[PDB]
Ligand binder design. Structure first.
Ligand code: NI
Length: 288
DNA sequence: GCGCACCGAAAGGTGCGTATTGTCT
């Protein structure tokens, strides 16, 4: 699954909290992109530099970016592309404990982002005429997480693409995100294909469903739903309001997701894993 | 965006809208 969300000023607090969330059996933060190579960024994401970049401060001595933003409009700080694995894949990786599956997810994400980068663009005006240039470079902060809001195993990565890109003439500008945003479904299929390929190299058999999504063949739907509490909460909201999931409006969909949410409280990380294992036995899951 | 108005200073730049599957911010 792949979803996008344009980030604005009001989201600056959430964007930097991508450090606190998830889970810790684990390089869970990493830089990516030619634009990042350009600025001298590699390895772990330094939280201090990340905040400055979100604010439009490339550092080194040039001016704060994006001053051309209209005061009656919102300032954009980035674009979050969130990659999520199928439930069974999260289970095998975080409950049974297969570290090679974590790597399979990371590779799939990295390869998809390379194709999103090929779609990076910027604008440039010369004597009144505006032109769109395919830029090819991005600055990305990647944060891997391990739990859902209800604390079920949920392997995912928040790829935060910063609102900046370097043109042919050497000038840094805001990202024209059209091609990346409109290619979300296509990029989601790239992630699915690469993940599948990496899992098959490890020896797993896959079961394709109907949307073109897949789950490991040895884990069934009943067992999957037993580790999908949020999905259960969303389904109850629709039922209570008497709505048909096949035809709900966007407003109703967002309402079901947002309003059925409970508050995020912390957990004892070592104890949670043991709970998962006992729950898995209860559901009759054989990880063999 | 389906070329605009309004940002700051460059006969220059930006938001805006874009999206829509499930494991579910
Ligand atoms: Ni997360």
């Amino acid at each position: 699954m792949l979803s996008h969300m344009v980030l604005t000023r009001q989201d600056i607090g959430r964007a930097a909290s991508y450090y606190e969330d998830g889970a810790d059996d684990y390089d869970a933060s990493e830089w990516q992109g030619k634009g990042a190579e350009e600025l001298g960024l590699s390895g772990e994401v330094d939280s201090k530099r990340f905040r400055e970049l979100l604010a439009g401060n490339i550092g080194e001595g040039h001016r704060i970016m994006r001053s051309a933003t209209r005061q009656d409009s919102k300032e954009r700080i980035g674009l979050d592309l969130t990659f999520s694995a199928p439930k069974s894949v999260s289970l095998q990786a975080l409950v049974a404990g297969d570290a090679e599956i974590i790597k399979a997810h990371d590779r799939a994400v990295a390869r998809t982002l390379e194709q999103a980068e090929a779609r990076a663009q910027a604008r440039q005006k010369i004597q009144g005429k505006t032109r769109i240039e395919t830029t090819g470079n991005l600055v990305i902060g990647k944060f891997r997480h391990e739990t859902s809001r209800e604390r079920d195993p949920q392997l995912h990565t928040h790829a935060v693409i910063l609102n900046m890109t370097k043109r042919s003439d050497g000038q840094w500008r805001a990202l024209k995100n059209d091609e990346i945003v409109k290619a979300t479904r296509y990029l989601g299929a790239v992630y699915n294909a690469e993940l599948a390929h990496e899992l098959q190299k490890l020896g797993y058999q896959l079961r394709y469903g109907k949307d073109g999504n897949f789950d490991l063949a040895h884990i069934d739907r009943q067992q999957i739903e037993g580790f999908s509490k949020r999905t259960e909460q969303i389904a109850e909201w629709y039922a209570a309001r008497g709505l048909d999931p096949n035809s709900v409006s966007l407003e109703q969909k967002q309402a079901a997701k947002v309003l059925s949410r409970a508050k995020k409280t912390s957990v004892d990380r070592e104890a949670l894993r043991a709970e998962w294992q006992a729950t898995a036995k209860e559901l009759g899951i054989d990880f063999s």
